[PDB]
Amino acid sequence: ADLKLFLESESFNIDVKHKERKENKFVEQDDWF
Amino acid sequence: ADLKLFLESESFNIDVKHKERKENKFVEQDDWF
Numbered sequence: 734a735d736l737k738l739f740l741e742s743e744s745f746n747i748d749v750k751h752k753e754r755k756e757n758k759f760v761e762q763d764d765w766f
Numbered sequence: 767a768d769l770k771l772f773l774e775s776e777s778f779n780i781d782v783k784h785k786e787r788k789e790n791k792f793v794e795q796d797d798w799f
Contacts, residue, residue: 757790757791758790758791758792759790759791759792759795761791762791762792
C-alpha cells in the first residue's frame with residue numbers, strides 16, 4: 734500500500750508510511766535446500 | 767544362542783555368554799513417537 738501511495742503520490746515513502754498504519758525424509762527436504 | 771547353550775548345557779548363562787561372543791520426513795517420525 735505504501736507502494737501504491739508511493740508510486741501514485743509524490744511525497745516519498747515516509748509520509749505514506751506513517752499514514753498507512755494509521756499513524757520423503759526430513760533428510761531429503763533438508764537436502765534440496 | 768546363549769539360551770541354546772543355557773538350556774542345553776548346565777554351567778549357567780554366564781560362561782555361555784562369554785563363550786558365545788568368542789570371549790522419512792520429520793513430521794512422520796515425530797508423530798509415530
